[PDB]
Tab-separated table of C-alpha atoms in Angstrom:
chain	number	residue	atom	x	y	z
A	678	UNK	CA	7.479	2.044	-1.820
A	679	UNK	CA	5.222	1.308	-5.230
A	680	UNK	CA	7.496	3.744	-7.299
A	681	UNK	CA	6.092	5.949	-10.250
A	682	UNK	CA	8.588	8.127	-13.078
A	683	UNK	CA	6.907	11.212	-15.441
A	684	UNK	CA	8.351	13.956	-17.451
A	685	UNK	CA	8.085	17.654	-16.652
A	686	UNK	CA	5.737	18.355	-19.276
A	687	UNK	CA	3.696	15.520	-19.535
A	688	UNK	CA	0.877	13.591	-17.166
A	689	UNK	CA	1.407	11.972	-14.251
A	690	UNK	CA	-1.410	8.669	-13.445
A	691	UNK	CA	-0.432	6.993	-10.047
A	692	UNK	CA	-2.286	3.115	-10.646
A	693	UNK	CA	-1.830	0.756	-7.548
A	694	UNK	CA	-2.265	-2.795	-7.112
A	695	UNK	CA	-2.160	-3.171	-3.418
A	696	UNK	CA	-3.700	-5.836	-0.988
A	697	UNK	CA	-6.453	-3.250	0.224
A	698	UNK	CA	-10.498	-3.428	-0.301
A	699	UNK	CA	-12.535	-0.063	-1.755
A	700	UNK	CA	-12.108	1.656	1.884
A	701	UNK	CA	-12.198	4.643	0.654
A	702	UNK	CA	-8.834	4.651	0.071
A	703	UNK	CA	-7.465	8.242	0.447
A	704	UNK	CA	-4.330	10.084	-1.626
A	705	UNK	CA	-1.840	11.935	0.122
A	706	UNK	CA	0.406	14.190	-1.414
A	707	UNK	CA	3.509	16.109	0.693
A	708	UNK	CA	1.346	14.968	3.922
A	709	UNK	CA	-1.598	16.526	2.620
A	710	UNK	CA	-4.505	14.744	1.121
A	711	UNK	CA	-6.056	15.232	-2.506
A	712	UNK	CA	-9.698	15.769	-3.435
A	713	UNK	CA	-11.300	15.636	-7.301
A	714	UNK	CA	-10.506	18.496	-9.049
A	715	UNK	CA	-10.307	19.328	-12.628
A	716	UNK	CA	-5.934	18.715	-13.194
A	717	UNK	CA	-6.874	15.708	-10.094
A	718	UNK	CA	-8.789	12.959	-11.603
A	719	UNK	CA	-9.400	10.213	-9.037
A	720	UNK	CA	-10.725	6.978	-9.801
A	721	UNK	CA	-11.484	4.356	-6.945
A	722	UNK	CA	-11.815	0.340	-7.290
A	723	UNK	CA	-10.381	-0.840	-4.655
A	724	UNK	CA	-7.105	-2.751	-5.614
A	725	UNK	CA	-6.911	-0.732	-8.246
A	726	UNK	CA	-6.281	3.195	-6.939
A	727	UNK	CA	-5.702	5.902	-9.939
A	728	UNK	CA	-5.005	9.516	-9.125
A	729	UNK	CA	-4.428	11.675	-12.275
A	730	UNK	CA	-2.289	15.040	-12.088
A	731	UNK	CA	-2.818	17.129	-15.469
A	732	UNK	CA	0.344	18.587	-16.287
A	733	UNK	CA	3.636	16.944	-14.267
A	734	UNK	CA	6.330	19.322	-13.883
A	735	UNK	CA	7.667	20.300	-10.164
A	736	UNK	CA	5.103	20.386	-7.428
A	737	UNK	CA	3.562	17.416	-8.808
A	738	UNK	CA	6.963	15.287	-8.340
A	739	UNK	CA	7.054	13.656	-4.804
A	740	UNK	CA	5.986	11.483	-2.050
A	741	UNK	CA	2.171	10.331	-2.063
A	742	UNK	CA	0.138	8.121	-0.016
A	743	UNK	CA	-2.460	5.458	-0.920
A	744	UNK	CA	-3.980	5.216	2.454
A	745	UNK	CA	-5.518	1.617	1.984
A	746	UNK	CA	-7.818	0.078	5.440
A	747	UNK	CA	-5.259	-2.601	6.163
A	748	UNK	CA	-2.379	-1.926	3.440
A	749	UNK	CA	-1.722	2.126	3.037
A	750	UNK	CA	1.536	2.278	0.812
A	751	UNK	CA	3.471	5.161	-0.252
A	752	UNK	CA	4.628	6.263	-4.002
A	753	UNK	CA	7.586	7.516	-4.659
A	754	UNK	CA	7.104	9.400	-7.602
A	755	UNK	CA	9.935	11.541	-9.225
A	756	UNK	CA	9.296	14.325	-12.781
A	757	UNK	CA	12.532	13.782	-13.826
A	758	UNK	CA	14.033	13.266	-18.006
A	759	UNK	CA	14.079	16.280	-19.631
């Protein structure tokens, strides 16, 4: 899993450099996916896949998917370090 570490206080950006095309790829967080908001800034280029959470502290720590066409990977991604 393409593994990602922030600190609860901080930001959390999720880049990926996977085998997959422009799609669009989708983010999944907790099974659920993520649209643009104003804390969620997406950015899509294909094999290159940035989601942005403003403000990393507990329910922004855990698994997420980067549901690429032929190469979907997930992120384990832990808030942890005080």
């Amino acid at each position: 899993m393409t593994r990602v570490r922030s600190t609860p206080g901080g930001d959390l950006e999720l880049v990926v450099h996977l085998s997959g095309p422009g799609g669009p790829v989708r983010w999944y967080k907790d099974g659920e996916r993520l649209a643009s908001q104003g804390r969620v800034q997406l950015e899509q280029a294909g094999a290159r896949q940035v989601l942005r959470v403003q403000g990393a502290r507990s329910g922004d720590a855990g698994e997420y998917l980067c549901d690429a066409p032929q190469d979907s990977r997930i992120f384990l991604v832990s808030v942890e370090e005080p």
